[PDB]
């Protein structure tokens, strides 16, 4: 029950700022901490208390830059024009790609990552305006085939039950 326990789409896009920053940086924190936890023990071990936190910051902070730049670019593009659409998410993806290019000192990564994250942004915007869900709850969940009641193969005999289908 705080401002940290907020979602990205709890408000319409462009209405709220700080909750969107906290939410998108929360997914950035989760992804960076998970990747750095499978990084600093497994490949390129730092062998120190301070370079481990340095690798944690190296794998975390640019993802905060990605999240903050994409959310601020989407907020500016939503507050600029009246209509909300997909190319706001596209230019936010290009801003996050520019943040990637500033991370890796390679413009080509910055563009290609901008194009990929813009495609991801327009697909996510199509999801949020068309109503379909990326990972929905499963409607049809087969717990078996036909005759799941009929293939009880047990050698012990069933005692008489205490329940009936007959009305009193």
């Amino acid at each position: 029950m705080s401002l940290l326990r907020s979602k990205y789409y709890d408000h319409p896009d462009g209405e709220d700022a700080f909750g969107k920053i906290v939410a998108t940086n929360k997914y950035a924190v989760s992804a960076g901490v998970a990747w750095s936890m499978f990084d600093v023990l497994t490949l390129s071990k730092p062998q120190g208390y301070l370079p481990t936190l340095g690798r944690f910051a190296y794998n975390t902070g640019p993802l905060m830059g990605m999240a903050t730049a994409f959310t601020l670019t989407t907020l500016v593009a939503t507050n600029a024009r009246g209509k909300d659409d997909k190319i706001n998410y596209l230019i936010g993806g290009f801003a996050a790609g520019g943040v990637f290019g500033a991370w890796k000192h390679n413009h080509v990564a910055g563009l290609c990552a901008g194009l990929f994250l813009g495609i991801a942004g327009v697909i996510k915007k199509m999801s949020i305006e068309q109503g379909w869900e990326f990972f929905p709850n499963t409607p049809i969940k087969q717990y078996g085939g036909l005759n799941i009641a009929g293939n009880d193969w047990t050698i012990m005999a069933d005692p008489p039950k205490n329940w009936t289908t007959e009305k009193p």
Binding site: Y143, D152, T154, M156, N162, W163
Partner: protein
């Protein structure tokens, strides 16, 4: 309870391992829950046996009873710290050892 997947004669020994039917105060409640778990099923029993599941759960797990007891114990110490309860009369009269 769970279900046996691809059930064989080898589950007949395993099925009677841990249950409350052997001389326990809760098992009749458990038996009643198992009754609707034989009637409604394992999946409809999670929704249509919410009363029978909770009675068995706070009968053998004793969750609500122990939360009640720890609220009764914390309020007395809270009154002692606040000064409403005197230190000489801090505890009530003890029960007889032949009781309970």
């Amino acid at each position: 309870s769970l279900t046996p997947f691809l059930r064989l004669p080898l589950t007949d020994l395993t099925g009677c391992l841990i249950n409350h039917q052997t001389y326990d105060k809760c098992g009749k409640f458990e038996m009643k829950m198992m009754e609707c778990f034989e009637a409604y099923g394992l999946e409809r029993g999670k929704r249509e046996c919410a009363d029978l599941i909770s009675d068995f759960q706070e009968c053998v797990g004793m969750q609500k009873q122990l939360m009640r007891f720890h609220a009764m114990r914390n309020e007395r110490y809270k009154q002692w710290l606040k000064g409403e309860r005197k230190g000489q009369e801090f505890f009530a009269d003890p029960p007889r050892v032949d009781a309970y």
